[PDB]
């Protein structure tokens, strides 16, 4: 198959922008996520747009402004249980669906996010 970055494959900037906007609306509404995210998600969304751009092989926007992602380390500041990772991923799938992003490039991207989310998990789930 022809080589292209996943960033291009999914439609680049415009897709990332739409996706992030949709994603944070879902995060704001999610009871497993809402309390650990800032009430104002403006800055978060900005950073995620930059991060996902870089993560997908687009320009290194996130590093330029914030330094190396060191995402797992940054996430040690929060309790990320498997349930919370599932909530994040469920918001992401819902946002991808909402913006009408479907197909193999979507799933390849989603699978990268499943792996990253798994890497972020840092606390056992709360059971009974
Ligand atoms: C697995 C579940 C996850 C949870 C519960 C979670 C939660 C959070 C929270 C609460 C913040 C702080 C936001 C802020 O201060 O503005 C954050 C930051 C961030 N997250 Fe996640 N996150 C998860 C997974 C991911 C994944 C999969 C990615 C990317 C693929 C990601 C990328 C980021 C980035 C780029 C930031 C900004 C770091 C910074 O302040 O520079 N997160 N996350």
CB atoms within 10 A of CB 70: 10
Residues in the chain: 128
- DSSP state for residue 100 in the 8-state scheme: T
CB atoms within 10 A of CB 14: 10
Gyration radius of the chain over CA positions: 14
Range of the domain at 26: 1-128
* SS3 state of residue 125: coil
Which residues have CB under 8 Å from 30's CB, separation 6+?
87, 90, 91
Query: At what resolution in Å was this solved?
Result: 1.5
- The answer to whether 54 touches 63, Cβ cutoff 8 Å, is yes
> What is the tally of structural domains in the chain?
1
- The answer to whether 121 touches 85, Cβ cutoff 8 Å, is yes
Task: Indicate which atom in ligand 1 lies nearest the CA of residue 112.
Answer: 30
8, containing H or E segment: helix 6-9
CATH number of 127's domain = 1.10.490.10
Concatenating the DSSP letter of every residue in 33-82 gives TTTTS-S--HHHHHHHHHHHHHHTTS--HHHHHH----HHHHHTTS---H
Tokens, residue 54: 């870089």
Tokens, residue 121: 């998990």
Query: Closest Cα to residue 119, out of 77, 71, 79, 52?
Result: 71
What torsion do the CA atoms of 77, 28, 111, 107 make, to the nearest 10 degrees? -160
The span from the CA of 96 to the CA of 105, in Å, is 11
Residue of 38, 62, 75, 117 to mutate, ligand 1, most atoms within 8 A of C-beta: 75
């Amino acid at each position: 198959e022809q080589w292209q970055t996943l960033y291009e494959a999914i439609g680049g900037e415009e897709t990332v922008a739409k996706l992030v906007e949709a994603f944070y609306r879902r995060v704001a509404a999610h009871p497993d996520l809402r309390p650990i995210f800032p009430d104002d998600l403006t800055e978060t969304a900005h950073k995620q747009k930059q991060f996902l751009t870089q993560y997908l092989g687009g320009p290194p926007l996130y590093t330029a402004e914030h330094g190396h992602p060191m995402l797992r380390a940054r996430h040690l500041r929060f309790e990320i249980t498997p349930k919370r990772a599932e909530a994040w991923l469920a918001c992401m799938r819902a946002a991808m669906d909402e913006i009408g992003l479907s197909g193999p490039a979507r799933e390849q991207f989603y699978h990268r996010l499943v792996l990253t989310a798994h890497h972020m998990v840092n606390t056992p789930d709360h059971l009974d």
